[model samples]
Structure formats: structure tokens, C-alpha cells
Target: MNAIGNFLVGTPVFTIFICLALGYLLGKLKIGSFTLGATVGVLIVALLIGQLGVFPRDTLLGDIFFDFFMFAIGYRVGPSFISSMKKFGAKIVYATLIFLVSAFIVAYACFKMFHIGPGIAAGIIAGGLTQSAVIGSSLETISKLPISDHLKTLYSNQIPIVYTLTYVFGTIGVLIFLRDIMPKLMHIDLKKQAVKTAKELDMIPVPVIVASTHFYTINDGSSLIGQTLGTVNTKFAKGLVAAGLNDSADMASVINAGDVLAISGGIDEIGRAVQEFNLLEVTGKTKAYVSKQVVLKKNFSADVLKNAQDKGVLVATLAGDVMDPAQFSTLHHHHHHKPAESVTLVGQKDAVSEVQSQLGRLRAAENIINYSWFALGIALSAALGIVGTKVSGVPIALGGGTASLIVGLVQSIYRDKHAHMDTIPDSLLEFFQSIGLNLFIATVGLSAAKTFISAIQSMGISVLLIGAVISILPHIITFVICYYLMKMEPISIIGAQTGADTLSAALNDVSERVGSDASPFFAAAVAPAYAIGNIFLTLMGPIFIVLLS
Candidate 1:
């Protein structure tokens, strides 16, 4: 009985597993993946568990997992920030104002004026379209918030509302509005800069340009920490071809047995052509000076780099790994890419620009796998959410690691992109993302379990109204400010400003209604918005949460 109690009390851990399984089952039943069925199904299960009052609510593991999730998302999304500047260079000035204003409104009004618990309000304000790591972290940071049944239940319920409000409609609504307004305001041909870039064209081959400099540090699978460029690729597949390897001491090219091979190849072709390279390009650009590689998860706009460079910021494209805004300490301003691996020298403009296009395709392909893999994988691996744990007693949730593993397996098996040229893979990808989204929303709804409902009861209409207003104000401000101030094109508004996690049906609808290029600005804008959001979210969110909660 004690053990049962212990297990039940754990967070969305057990409950989420059940919901994921239930969601998957419903998906298999053909009710559809993104329907209310999947979303409500998970909510119903969570509500039931919350009401049962049998589960323990003491573990911080959920919080820890969420932290890992947050850091990963932020790091992965950092690289693409530069692309935002290239197209909507001036508008970013407006976007920055919008971001600041929204942040201030949330902090001052939501946190200060209303006096809601600092952590809760901060969490709510820091809310993102997907992945509630910011909120979770805010909650964790504001440890001083009184943890009573009522407060807990209120927080629990508030999360889902926040999630649904911001994620579902907030991101989409502004994106739609921006589609029409920005192009007209800027008087710049949106089609070429924003629209063309974001267009979802059929995948094609892209040319590769490699940047290999003597400055990069390469390491072998040896005991030594840092090795020279030449020895790096012996174990890893060299992507781009690098010539002119000058030893700095002599300032002359010296070819060694272990000299770094900066190899450049087509995205799919390169991935397939070089299987031996464990560290292959998934998305974005990587700079390898003799196997010293930096993987930028996202791509930046060319304009942003130019702006940074113009300011004597020494703009470079750095992988999220080892990215320090501080590193831009002197003239070293950088445009971030989320999928980027680490902080290394930014490649020349031409090389970065070329790779940026390919990264878009890579992201599209990865999404197909990212969105679809988990729900199916968890069910396939351990029958619903009971993932096997070779190391620990606690099993991984169904929507968690299992899906990632399976996606990895499928890609590995497919070997070549042309292998399954049909819609199966694509369909599966859409299904995964759509279903996962619904389930995630349902989880938010279910989280409302008790505390959320209590907040409504305890606070009365005023609190609810205030919460609702604050919830939506950011989106409105973001949309209006970005559209009017930055003169952003529609595609950029949706894709870049709101964060790309919610590539929802609304985006598809807009694309169909307005034109295919309606949402292409995202290809340009996603990087910068996300990069700035990540760097600041961590610093500002927690502080505000602690102050308000």
C-alpha cells in the first residue's frame, strides 16, 4: 500500500505515461491524431488521477527532467537567430521593443500589479508555445511560494490554461495577422525575402562549402583533452574539404597525417555518403577545424550577422553548446542557431548562407521524425508507457525517450532519403507531431486537476479575468508591435516570433488561404526570436518568479 501510494504520487510520470498510451491507442483507432479525442482523452485520465488523491506529489524528478528538457530546447534553438536579421533587419528593432514591452507588462502588471504568487505568475508569463520548461523552472525557482493543497491545485490547473491559451491560439493568432500587415507596412517585397525562404518546396540538393581553419581544436577518442586539427577525423567522417592548413607558428601550410578534412556535401547525400561519421550534420552548419566540430541546431539570417558585424560585434555563428553572450565580450557578437553544436568561429557569409538553406530542409525532415517517433516508439518498446530501465527502477515515460530511440532506428534503417520516397514517412511525421501536440495540451488540461480549480474558487472573477487578460496580452502586443514596428511579413510573424514548435493547422490554413508562402518568414525569423528568448528567459523568468511568488 505504501509502495502504491509512492508510485501514484509521482507527477505526469505515471499519469503522463497512461495518457500517452491512451492517446496512442486512440490514434490507432482512427479517431485521428489531432482531434479532441486525443487531447481530451489524456485530460480525462489526468483528471481522474488528480481526483483519486492516491498519488504522492513530493518528487523533484519531474522538475529535473523538465529542466533538462528546457536547456535542450533552448540550446538546440539558438543557432538560427541570425537569419531573422537578414530579412527583417530593421523590424528586429521593433521586435525587440515588442519583446521588452511584453516582458515588462507581464512582470509589472502580472507580477507586480496583481501580486499573484511570484513564481506562478512568472511561470505563466514566461510560458512558451510548446515545452513548458520556462514555467516549470519558474515554479521550481520560486521555492518560497507557500505549498499548500489549495495553492498546488491552483497552480496545477493554471498550467493547462496557460498552455492551451498561449500555445494553441496565441502563437497562431498573431502569425495570421502578421501575414497581411507586415508586408504592406514595410513596402518591401515580402515574397522574395520572407515568403520565398519559408516556402515548403520539395527537397532538393544543395551545394556544400567547407570552412576549415587552423584555429579549430580537434580531439581523437584519446585520453588527451585537446588535440590538433589533423587527427580529428580519423574516427569521424570529415564533411567539408579543407585545404590550406597553415601552422600558426610558421604561417605556412603543413599537411600532417592527422590534418583536418573540412568536407562539404549535400545534406541527405552527405548523411548517407558518410555513415562512419557519427557526428553527422542533422541540421544547421558545423565548423570543424580538424574534427573540432560545432553543431548549430538552428540557422540564422544573414542580415543579423551583418548587423552584428557592422556594430563591430564580430558576429559569428556559434553552436548553442558553449555559447556565451559574454563571449561576444568584445567585438564578438554572434547570431545563434539552436541546433548548432557549440560556440566556434562563425564561418564566412557565403558558407553560412548556403548552409542556412539546407538547414531548413533538415529541420523539416527532423520534424517528421521528431513529432512522430515517440508515441509510437513508447508503445512499441514497452507496451504503452512502461519503458525498460536497465539502470534505474523508474521507467521512462512513453512520450519521453522511447520515441527518440525509435526515430533513430527508423532513419538508420531507411539509410537513404530516397529509400521510402512515399508519404508513409511524411504521414507518420505529421501524425507524431499532431498527436503529441494534442496529448501535450491534454496533459496541461489534466494538470489543472485540483489547484487550478481552487484558484478560480478562491480568487473569484477578478483574478480569473486578470489572469486571462495577462495570458493573451503578450500575444497581442507581440503581434501588433512586430507587425507595425518591425513591418514583419506574415511568414516571419508566425514562424520566427512565436517559436516554431506550434507549426499548427492554423499555419497550414493561412498558407492555403493566403498563399503557400504565408508562413515562410519563420524560415527567416525563427532563429533570432528563439535565441533571444532563450538567453533572457532563463535570467529574467526566475528572478521575476522569485520576486512575485
Candidate 2:
């Protein structure tokens, strides 16, 4: 054991990797509905490994990974976050605000009541809220304090013990509370209310296919190539009403990879055709999937969604304006058929390609990212941190992970409008979010093992009690306010509250419990709240440093 510990201590990077491996291995197992998840799983394994008091002390390595993780999170959430706000507007915003306020109100009350250090307080917020971004943001702020390095290090060490406790229970608590307790509290069927709301809003779920047009780029060597577009309509997707293919390309009975075209059909048929014909996207270098504004001469009706389900086919949305169904319903019912400037539709030739200037736009591939833009964003973030201001104690700026997140958001928003701009794909961002964060966490657990163990042995159960309060109370508070006082949709409330806390799994758990009917609600509520939470909830972390001591 001594020999092994010595080797691990001497070779800290190896220790960190080992923790990630073991952590992920442990994370995959589930005792019933709960799993430790990768982040917590790695922290636990790393802490256990570090118990031997043999690990590296440098935090620079951790800081790099944490910054990239923050940027990726912000970038991913940016476009959706902005779009949800435009679509749902003030009602959803109010729910998110209440949720954020409740979280801080509870966390701050506990911070003062217990006379806890800022680090531990930040941990409770991080774990209790399940927003891991808090960990990086808090540490970033902690380093900026007027306090000595030794004290700062000591305070920073206090975070994980409470974080670990709160996160595990928080994950479980949010799940059980959302699924079991809240439904009973409201005296309503959770799933049914959500489905009803979705129906009312005309945010029809995909199971109810609507006539819609979707565009895709053909991949090289795909079965789609060399097959006539009509062949696709007959063989691959019988429900398709027409191939909304471009005319200028001059394809006869033949098509090829790199061919850009549109198909209007039952969405299920679209979904199936993409699978059956093996629809292609792009390498990180290439792109596909874009939203086209079909200037509607007439308002589409809810019957399209209803009728398409009964038979086959409709459209989807970008921002608040979809090309079909609920969006169409919204245009007529609310706006009296005064179409937005950029309306979308999926039908015949005149409806699709009759656009004044273009047929469709190109979308960045799911895998590709503009490294040039990203590196520049990081550099700007670093520079922002360097030009610091001091008012209270020590110089501080929205530097490090804080700046990275903001920069990522800005970059993503730009990427959405400008074709030249680029953003990271979800799969690629997973590397930065998952492996990046776990690597940083590995270092955190290793360095803080002794302190973590000490905190565990002392007042551990008491902290768990604190964690429980912080974890569960805001959920209830937000639910009551959103559901009763605001008269908001329960499904939106559930999604908004859970998302605001960053309890992603809770949303998934609820979605599963309620079945597919809740899909639209989950889609509508999750991304915006997650973005709101990621930005503002994490901003609360820095305040702990200021407020506590």
C-alpha cells in the first residue's frame, strides 16, 4: 500500500486518469433510479485514492480544464437560451427568476445562520443547485480575495465535502420531489397537465406528425446518392407529400452526395426517411441543417397537425415561429394572421422556393467548430481578467471561467446569425464538458482529500441536513409560486424549476415517468432554464465569497 501510494503520489497525472476510469466505471451502475453520475463518481474515487496523502498541489492544470468546460456549456446553451426567451417570453422568465431567488435566499440564510466559510456555502449552492459551474466560478473569485494564499487554499478546500454530499442527495431529491411529491401537492396528474398545456400552445409533439419540410445534405457513399428524389418519396418515405428539392441544381432522375434539397412530408416520414435513406450531415469541417423562412401567404391551421396525424405529414419552428401547426395556430389565434416578417412554411414549390433571394441556408455541421473563433474568445476572456478592478478586496474581473462563459454565449449568439461564425458540436463539447471537468475534479479531490475526510468525520450528518434543506426547499417554493400564484402550466413549472437548478436528470426522469406526452414541455422548458441557471445561478457563487466573510 505504501509503495503504491508513493508511486501514485510521484505520478499524479496517472492517479488522475485512474480516478477518471474508476469513477466512470462506478458511475455507470445504478442502485434503482439513481446513479452517482460521472462528475461525482470521479470525485469520490479521486478522494478515496488521495486518502494516502500523495498528490500534486498545482491547480493550474485544473483551471485550464474548468475554463474550457464553462465555455462549452455557455456556447451550447446560448442560441437555445435566447430563442426560448423570445418564444415563451415573460412567463417562463418569471418562473426562472423565482427559482433562482429561492435558491439564493435559502443558501444565503444558511450561510449566515451557520457562520460557514464562503467556500462551503458555495459548495452547497453548487451541489444543492446541481450547477457545477459554481465550483469554477467560486474558486476563481476566491483567488481574488484579499486573504492570504494559505487561507484562500484552505477556504477553497471546504467546497467539495459539502458539494459531494449535496449533489448526490440533490440529484435524488430533485428526482423524487418532482416525480412523487409535487404531483400530489398540485392535486394534478403531472404528465397530463403538461400534455394539455402543450396541446393548448400548439407545441404539438412529434408523435403527432405535422406536414413539415426539413432539409439535409447528402453524405458521401450514402444510399441516398444516385437514387432519384422521387425514389426517396416512394421507397424511403411514402408519407412524404413532395421533394422540396432545389430546381437550379438540375438533377434528372439522379442525385448525389453534397446535394442540398428539401422534403415536405409527415414529420414521421421525414424522421423515417432520414433513417431509411441514411441522411447525411457533415464532418467538423462541413455543415447541414438550416431554417428557411417560408413567407406564408395564408395562415396554416391546427388541422394540419391533427390531419397529418390521422393521415401523414407538417413543419417545425425556429425561435417562436414554426413553419406549421402551433406556430400557424399562434399566428392566426393570437396575431390574427398578421405574419411575422420571417414566417416559415412547408408545402408546394411557391411556398418553399418562391423566396425572393434564396432557397435555403447552410448550417454548420454538428461536429465542426471554428477553433480560430474559440481561441480568440478564450484570449479575450484571459485579457478581461487581467485588466482588473479593486473596490472591496483584491482586484477582480469577469476573468477565467466567468469570462469564458460570457464569451461563449456571445460567440454562440453570433454564430447563429452569421454563416461564417461557428460553434462546437454537442458531441465535441462533451469532451470539454465531461472529460475536461472530470480531469479538473480529479485534481480537486486529490489535493483536498484530507480536508474532505476531516469535514466528513466532523458534523457530516449535520451538513447533510443543511444540504437537504438547500436542495429541496427551492423546488417546492418555485412550484407553489409558478403553479398557483402565476397560474403557469405545471409542465412548464416542473421543467423550469428543475432546469433552473440544473437538475437535468430530473427532467429526464419526469419525461420518462410521464411518457412521451411531456416531450414538448421538456423541450420548451429545459434549455432556457438551463442557460438562465448556468449564467445567473453560477454568478451567485462569486457572491458567496463577498457575502460570507
Candidate 3:
């Protein structure tokens, strides 16, 4: 192979396109999703070609490119982490702590067992910078170490394999085991627990009015309390009807928040007052308006207009008023408008239900099958990057994480199950992965700023050994913990744990076991964990690596 530049830098765009094509083929054969099988396939082919002595002994380009990819993957995982923690709260915290601690202990075990340095062992346990940035950092750190070139060569050779092992199996294993174990340990009766919890939480199909829904502001010695549709209850006033809250400067405490109230009694009531509170009353807001920002010709259904109301802003669509009903679908694009306006404030439903809906969407269990394939693709590519980048002439860039992001966005673009993505998600995900990877690469350089080759050389072997042990051990432990402690239903928990898109599968199972409302329970339990896990996994890869290394 011909050497190109100082770092033997080269583009992997060709490889990406090839993998995409191959991935499609794999999908056709019922083998798997395109990205996972395909990206890994290309990497293997390239590696085999390189190994056959086709590429020069100084192959280095792959690593550079691989590092870029790793960073991108990790960066994309960032948002997943934030969103996951918020929904799962305590559960996520417990899971994260276990994962991190297990990582540290596993690394330590490897170091002690192999007599390796803590740093290298940490890397071994590092999970191949599962996102992207860490792999680059580890490489850079090793390169700059003052250790002998011989030790560096050895460290470089073994480090990638350690990560590949975990990337290939670690995450999936965790999912599988978590499902099996949760039932035994927590006696969780996953299906029953879910249904029970939702019921216990008082999840009425209709939005229940509560006192907290109403807010009473003190003014003119008379209270025109500002209350939410949610908080309207008899506790606040004797007749707490679904009279929508109005926009005003101040109000009195005549009504307390969280008061139980009514919107419209029935569908006819909804139609009668449909103009009064829009969807809050009719519950017939057109789903088609979810994404579009079109201007209404004369007026839309009362449901559509009312669904968009906001208490703070009196700018609600009246029955005869002209307005634009944004995208009418269930899905929304936060990118179009940050801090999207709250759903129409004209009427209220159970605040908990609304909150649960948003939360459920956040986890996106309904589309787990797609996400699972995406995650798998990312893992395989990350593995390839870790291994291939070490050679002299290969360009290393890490974008395995792109699997989830690209597939996810494409799936999101057109919700129809059979619709083709047309590669838009691939393009957008690639863009995002690039930005994230760049940040990681830049950070790697910075991480080495104050260090020296000597420092790295001294720690190199030990770090490598330690990294391997720690990386693999905690994953096994986490899988066990997730299984037993969570007390998950076998099918439901298992699917969720693996990012398996078997929500419908699980729902079907639950329906068989319990009843139809089991779907709502399923929505409550697994809904919070899906995206949250990915978010944390992606970002935390680098964060944890930096902390440990």
C-alpha cells in the first residue's frame, strides 16, 4: 500500500458506502440489519486484506479514522445518557454506579492478575471507547508514553482485541441476563407490577382533575387563582369543572392546585365546548399537525386549535380563528424549536398521563427493533476501529455509534414500518458522528498535553492488561445485577435490557398473562429505560475512560 500523509490519513467514505450496500444485502437475506453485519463485514475484509501483507507494514490510516468514529459514537450517546437518567431516576443511578464501579474493579483485577499498570488495564476495561473518543485518547496516550517502542507495539496489538470482545457481546449480554434475573430477585412479576404501578399511580384514561392543576394567585383581595387543568379538583372548590385556566397577571387562592376537575363529560360535551378548550375537550386533535407549521385557511377542528393552547400565552386558536396546526403526528422534532410550546392549554388531562406520554416517547420502546439493530451496527464498527486503527498505514476513525443514530433518525423520519430511509438518516447521523468524533479527537490531543512518552511507557503494559480485565468483568456483573435486582418480567425486561424492539412482543406477552391494560403498564415500566441507557452509555464511555485512565 502507498503511504499518503504524515498520519497516513485517508477517507473511509468508500468503505461506508460499501458497508451500507452490504448491510442492505444482509437485511434482504434475513440475516440482520444493514449497518451491523455490513460495517463489520467491511472491516473484516479490510483487515484480512491488510493482514495478508497487501497493505504496507506501516499501515496507520485506519486508526486515525477509527478514532474519529469512536469519538462520534460516544458524543451521540451523550444525549441518551441525560434523557435516561431523568426518566429512570433512581434506577438509572443504580445501574450507572454499578457499571462504573464494576469497570474499575474489573480493571483493577486485570492489573493485579497480570501485573500490568493501572492505566493500561483501565483501557483494557475501557470498552473500546464505546462511543469513539476514548479509543483515540487511549491510542494517543500510549503513543506519547516514554515506554520502549517494543512495549508500545505489544500494547497496541492487544488493546483493540480486548475492546472488540466487549463491544461485540457486552451490551447484548447485559440485556439478556437482566431480563432473566429481574423476576427471580425482585419477584417483580414484571407484567403485574407494571399494571399495578400504573393503577396505583391513579392513571385514569381521562385526565383527572386535581388540586395542583389549579394555581391561585392573590389579587384585589379576591383570588383569581392560576390553576392547571390537571390540578382542578373538588378540594379547591365545590364545583371544579374543566373551565380552562385563563391568562392573567395575578389571581387569588380561591382554587388550589391539584384539584380534580372535569374537561367535557363526554364526546358530545367535547364537541359542545370544543371551541372553548380545543383538544382538551374534544380529544380529537388531528395527529397530522404534529410536524407541519402550516397556516390554517379558516380554522381547524376545535380539537386541533385547543391542543396548541398555552396558559402563559393567550394566543390560542379559537373555533373560528385562523392558525397553523404544527405537525399533527405523535412524533415531534425538538430541533425545529427548542423548548417547544406546551400542548394547547385550553383543557387538561391527567398531568401524570401527559407526563407519562412524553416519558414513553422518550424511551421509544415501540421502535426497539430498529434501535437494537442500530446499536449492534455501532458495536461492530467500534470493534473494527479498535482493531484496525493500530496498524501503521490504516486510518483510524470511530463512528460505530452512527449505527444507532442514523438508523434511528431515518426510522423517525417516516414512521411507516416499511418506508425506505433514502439514506437521509445515514447522512444526518454521519454529520453528527463527525462533529462528535472531532471533539473527541481534539480532546485526546489535549489529554496528552501535559504527559510524556516516558510516563506512557512506564504505564503502558500494565494499563493494557488492566484495561482488558476490568472492561469485561463489570459487564458480566452488570448483567447479573440488572437481571436479579430489577426483577423484570422475562420477556419485557429482556427485550428492553437488550434494546430489543420487542415492545409489541412484550406487550403481547403481557396481554396474554394479565389483560389489555397491561400495555399501559408496559408503557410505564420500560418506557423510561430505553433511550436513557443509550444516552448514558455513549457519553459515559469517554467520561469514564478519562476518569479511570
Candidate 4:
């Protein structure tokens, strides 16, 4: 009726952007650690604005955003999901399976007990898990149904209404429960256990002061010379490694007293070795000498080079081909020679930059986006979904979300094999993924706004109560399993739970409370669960709808 209303009604794009901006601004509002995130804010604002009679044509825009969001979700989780099978194995698999299985079962039971419709039932699962993919996947299922147009529209509209109403409590409840209640209930000290886990797993880095490597010169009258590099290295009390010999050709070469030998090891060991052998520091004209060593742990020492190559730690090998630990492994494995228990990685820092990669010290200020791979992966996913088979005449396809997820999983596994598939920088990747999801949320809000209030009023308090039960019960069930049955570490259990729920905000809160020690374990455990949960929840949406209908 007003000028602004008239303009918004006339121009739908303007309406969508305005809703997005205001939603984002309102999303920043927090009440004691419970903030309405961008997705919720946008949906709520759009719903309120819809009360003003501003209906927008957002189907295409919404589709684009949903597709991109789904793809980004898969891409982000791909590497971790693939790697988890090899590294985490049973723990990750078991946690993810139990949480998701129990979540779906509880959701279905709530639907049947409450006598809710298919749309409401699916929305409960989506909102409870905080998984946005459920919206698109559920809508897709609705679109393909044999029902009449009126019933189809009714079903589709019910999803966002139920989702938007319930998601706020779902997000907040998980954040508080995971950060405070779950740990206390499990009788675990968050900080102390995090520290202990880091130490036991060697997840915490050795300090730079303690881990530094330096070169030492062998002074004249150092046992009067003529000893092999390996022999002298073995004779030292310290774990000092003989990296190189200046006047000699190889490790087998006899070292004279005047020869300036280079050693690589921790500072304490180097200091002790220097005092014992009277070795001098190698200084000046350092550019003329080329020396290197690679430190390998006992587990991978024999196949050190191969492991390095697989982990992308060979990206900056100093003095290219300076040492081939794999070659050593070949000799030991083939000839039955005794392999060295450990190997020290030594090289110019810049040349062996991949060493930093191995140490998790790599940074990317200006990350390449790799849009080519992103687009190609999405195309492949679409194709897979279209080619999928049917189930009981219901056309049970993988759906775009699951198809993209599978592609992401494959890409993560083969990223090392294909250089072009390098992962996008974390910060940049998060930006795209979050933005895309928000866009999808905004569009859903606008579309559902017209009927949202009436639907809520019609459903009344019963729907809200049901939503609360669905939101809280899965977590309670999983918490019991984690504490009593699985006996998992509290940190890992929380991470997996948040991940299964796809509640990033909750996960971030837990991360802040738990410290850096829990990050890798949390990250490693969550991604696969999130990916699998998204796919599972998305598929369950249609299945639940059919059963309920």
C-alpha cells in the first residue's frame, strides 16, 4: 500500500536483496551465546515481509543457490570423508552411523506420533539436524509426486514453515548442550582432556626452540679423522643425524678432521654433540654448501619418500632429489637389509616448503578458486542424479545433493593424483559455502512467507512441541550412546554429534571452548558425518513424506 511496498511488489529482485540485507543484519543479534544465524534471520525477515503481500518470483534464483550450496557442501567434505576411511576408520564410521540412524528413527516416530503431514515431518528432520539440503531435496521429491497441484503446493509450503519455526531452538540447544551439558554429563574436563589427547597423539607441535636444526663443523683432531659419516653419527650420544659432509661425496665417504660436517637435529641434542665433539658452527659462504636430511617417524621411515609424496609434502623439496628415502626403503625391502629406524628431513626451508605443509604450517593469502573443477564436479553430480535408478516406482534418485557429495568424496581421494584439483583455501571456501547457503535460505523464506503465519497458527502449539522433541531427542539418545556404550572421548563425540547435525555454529562454540588440541580430531570426525548426514537426511525427507502421506 505504501511507496516501498509498491516498489518491492513491482521489482522482485530488489525485494529479495532487501530481505537478504536486513536478515543478515538481524542475524548478528545475540542473546547470551544464542545468536540467530544468517539463514534463520533471512528466513524470519522474509516471512514477516511476506505478511506485507510482497510475493517474489524466486524459483530460478533459489534453484541456482541451492545447487551451488549443495555442491559446496560436498566439495568441503570430500577430502575429509575420503581420508577418514584410512586414518580414522571405525571410530568415525561408528559415531556417524549411530547418530544419523537414531536421528532418522526419532524423527519418523515423532511424525507418526504427532500425526504430522509429510512436509512437516521432513522439515522436522531438516531443522532438527540444521541441514539446509533437506529443503531442496524435499522440494524435489514433492515436485516429482503423483499428487495434484493443490496438494503438492500444500506439501511444499509446509516444509520451510516447520523448518523455520523449529530450527532456532535446534541450533541453540545443540550449542549449549555440546559445549556445557554433554561434557559435564560425561564427567569429562574439557580443557584437561583436550590437552591430554593432543600430547598422546603428538597433535601438538614441538616448539620452534626445541625442534630447530642447525649445522655443525667437525674440527681438526676430531678423533684424528678417517671415520665414516655413518660411524661418527652412530657414535654420538645425541640423536644427531649426519646430514652432509663438505669435503666428502656421500654418507659412505670417510670424514677427515678438517672436513666441516653438517648435522640436523633438535637444539639440545646438537648442543650436547657440539660440546662432546668440539664441532664448530658452519657460518659464512653457506650458499656454497648443499646439505639436506629428512626426519621420518618409525612407522613410515622405510617408505618415507613415498609417504611424503602422497601427503603433498614433496612440493618444495630443497635441492631437488637431495635424498631419496624411498630409495632406502627399496634397498631394505628388496635386499632384506636393516632399514634405519628414523630419517631426518633436512633441506633449505624455502626449497623444501612442503616440509612446512607436512607440519601444518602452510598458509594461503591469495588462494586460487579453481572454478573449473567446481563447475565440472557439479555437472558430473547432476548427470549421476539423472542416471540413477528408481525404487518402487518412486524414482529414488541420488538427488543432486547426494550425487555432488559422492563426486566430492572421489575428488578428495584423488586430489593428490590430480594437481588441478587442489583444494580451495579454507577461508575462501567457507565464504562461498556460507554465502550460497544463506542465499538459498533467503529465497526459501521469501517463497514461504505468504503462508507461513497462517500455517503456524493452524498447527498451533502442538507443532512447536513436536519440533522441540525432534530437536532434542536425537542428541539425548546419541549422548547416552557416546557416554555409556561407545565410551568415546568427549571431544570427539561432541564434534561428531555437531557434525551429524550440521550445526556449524554449535561446532564453533565447542571449538572455542575446547582449544586447538581438539580441532583436528573434531575436523577429522565431523566432515564425513556432515556429508553423510546431509545425504541421508535429504533422502529420508521424501521417504518419510511418502510413508506419512
Per residue, candidate 2 scores C-alpha lDDT tens digits across 412-433 of 7666545433566666665676
Residue 14 of candidate 2: its Cα lDDT?
86
- The residue-by-residue lDDT of candidate 3 on 1-549, one tens digit each, is 444322222433443343334433442343321112223333333332222122231223334343334333332333233333344445544554556556545544444455544234424444422323344545565666567888777766544544433332232333223433444455556556655644543332534322112222222322224543334322222212343333221122233433322332223333433333232212232221111112222123334333332211111221212223343332343344232222222223333233224322221223224544445444554554344233232223323333333333333323322222122233334444333323222222222222322333555444433433343455456657766677433333433432312111122223333443433333333333433443444333334334433
How do the residues 1-549 of candidate 1 rate in per-residue lDDT, one tens digit apiece? Answer: 555545666554666677667754553454422223343344455554555444333224433232222222222212232334454655644564466557556657655565566534554554433334455555554444566767666665555454433443333333334444444544544445544554433221243333232222222442212433333322223232221222221112333433333333223434443444432222223332221222223334434433322211222223212122344333222463112223233333344343434222221223234334333333343332233321111112322322232333343333232222212243443344344444444454445455444544654445555544554556567767666665555555555444322223232333333332333334234434443454345445556655654
Q: After the best TM-score superposition of candidate 2, give how far the Cα of residue 29 lies from its true spot, in angstroms.
A: 1.0
Residues 1-549, candidate 4: write the lDDT tens digits. 577678778887778888888887887777764456566567667777766775764656765565565555555544444444455556666877888889778876676675768888877767667766567677777788789999889878888777766665576566667766777788777667766765655456553433334555667667727887667656744334555566332557788765677665556767887787777887734552233333232334333354432221222222222234444443233333222222234433342444433332222122666666667776787787555544433444555545655675566445423332345555654555556656766666666565556656877467767877777788899878876887776767776777677775554445445555544455556656666665566677677777776
Candidate 3 residues lying further than 4 Å off, grouped into runs, are 1-15, 27-86, 114-123, 126-472, 486-549
Model 3: how far is 245 from its true place, Å? 33
Worst 10 residues of 1 by lDDT: 389-398
Give residue 347's error in model 3 in angstroms: 20
Per-model lDDT: 0.40, 0.63, 0.35, 0.60
- By lDDT, is 1 or 2 better? 2
Deviation from truth (RMSD, Å), model 3:
17.4
The model with the greater TM-score, 1 or 3, is: 1
Cα misplacement distance, residue 371 of candidate 2 (Å): 2.5
Best by lDDT: 2
Q: How well does candidate 1 score on lDDT at residue 32?
A: 29
Model 3 quality (TM-score): 0.36
